[PDB]
Amino acid sequence: HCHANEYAYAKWKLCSASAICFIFMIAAHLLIDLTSFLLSLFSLWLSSKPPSKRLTFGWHRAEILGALLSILCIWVVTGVLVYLACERLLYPDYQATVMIIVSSCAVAANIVLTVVLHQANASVRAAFVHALGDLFQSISVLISALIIYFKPEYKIADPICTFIFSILVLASTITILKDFSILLMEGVPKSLNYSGVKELILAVDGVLSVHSLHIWSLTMNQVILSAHVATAASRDSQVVRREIAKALSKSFTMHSLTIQMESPVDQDCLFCEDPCD
Amino acid sequence: HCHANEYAYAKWKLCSASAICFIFMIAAHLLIDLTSFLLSLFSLWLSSKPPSKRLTFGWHRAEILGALLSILCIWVVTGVLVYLACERLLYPDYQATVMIIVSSCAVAANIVLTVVLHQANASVRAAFVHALGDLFQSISVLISALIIYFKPEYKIADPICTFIFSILVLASTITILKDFSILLMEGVPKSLNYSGVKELILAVDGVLSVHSLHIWSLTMNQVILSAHVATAASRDSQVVRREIAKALSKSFTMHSLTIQMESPVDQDCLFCEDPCD
Ligand SMILES: [Zn+2]
Ligand SMILES: [Zn+2]
Ligand SMILES: [Zn+2]
Ligand SMILES: [Zn+2]
Ligand SMILES: [Zn+2]
Ligand SMILES: [Zn+2]
């Protein structure tokens, strides 16, 4: 045959944040937040579906697609806030404490959303940064309000306040796009290393030359491995991988293995060579 | 060992469209169109790179990531044009033939961009729809101009003109997102069929029960196959797949095969069962 509660864990942790912004009707930004969540949550309902004929590996990956969307909804939001800050700069006419407690309530609220996403699921590490950004964005108008209120002589420190805080957003979203670009490109995941498994595999008896390895991954923790191995022709074949699986599954967890057990007649070729790093 | 000119074909066909909008400095929207292009082209330069250690399958898939971006740059563009049409509706003050030949030159120009992308590469079928949309968008202001100029009594037919033509954009971009959602989710590609290969494989002698098939695809024409097959224990194993490859490669083209040749002792399980369709 050659053969848990992390799923609803987020559904717990995520549905909360959806309600907070929902209950946050004390007015744009909030409405936009109320949109990213449910959809992203709805994606979390997708990965639960069983693998269908059209999607053989199943809807596992769909989470990231929802996640990667949430990120690009942050760039649009902050994209507006830089252009308006520019408009708020070029049209300098604007007029306080009224604009403080309306933000004094917001900043503390976003801490709630952020702290409950205390770092698993990608959507978690996707909605989290969406909130964190929305926090640092929120303190901009606050930390400015407690500045111009006391020092209204300038009243122009607010634009740069956003400008420096906008970068605090984008410089905090790259760390997630350095990763989700590797997933959608079928690259080796973070927690592993390409040569880190070749040697780890070459440490078994029958193997001769692991050629044409391919190890991509699904969302965050689902990894899939695939390779062709060369075995001692005098040695029995099936028994070897009968351990290699154990040899790998013991090393760490998998979601599907396919090993080919090619025979010791390979035309010693760029395709089954090596990655040139 | 168990072992063309389509690449630069687009680089030919794509660099052209990049120059046309570049040379189109006869004014914004043109600049946005220019930004979308080169990047997408730059992605086409990525897929040429050889497979590296971090990206085992290689940068083939990266094209789609660039492609899928171009699409979402269309929704943003048309997103602006519906809100402005709304603003152009709610603020009805606006005032002709001056606004005709400035568009009479545009519409015909977009035909050039579209016709040279006469339907291969995804980026082709990605930049194409980006242009086609930008055409139907362009005729809106034109077909309206030759209406209100002759019948200025209304001058309100222009908003709905965009509104109906905006849908002509989005209803033309879905056909590409029905597909590129299957690629990034590792689903079986269009040109194939899940059961279409099981039977096509089960038509060989040694095979007993192809279990745990997995057939996803890279960008458009690169397909990868992977499966475990059961063979007659009395029959020799390696010789079977020594044909199955031919049996499939003869059927159509591949980019990597991994077959496991499991033995006839499988615990007759949901995992190696079937996709429930
Ligand atoms: Zn799965
Ligand atoms: Zn091989
Ligand atoms: Zn080779
Ligand atoms: Zn390739
Ligand atoms: Zn098997
Ligand atoms: Zn099974």
Author numbering:
A (entry chain B), B (entry chain A): 52 to 54, 64 to 87, 105 to 172, 175 to 198, 210 to 358, 361 to 369
Article passage:
ZnT8, one of the 10 ZnTs that have been identified so far, is localized in the insulin secretory granules of pancreatic β cells and responsible for the accumulation of high level of zinc inside granules, which is required for the packing of insulin in the hexameric form. ZnT8 functions as a Zn2+/H+ exchanger. The structure of HsZnT8 in the outward-facing state shows a ‘V’-shaped dimeric architecture similar to the crystal structure of EcYiiP, with the two TMDs forming the branches, whereas the two tightly packed CTDs located at the base of the ‘V’ and mediating the majority of the dimerization interactions. Our structural and functional analyses reveal a total of 4 Zn2+ binding sites in each subunit, including one primary site in the TMD (STM), one site at the interface between TMD and CTD (SIF), and two adjacent sites located in an open pocket of CTD covered by a HCH motif from the N-terminal segment of neighboring subunit (SCD1 and SCD2).
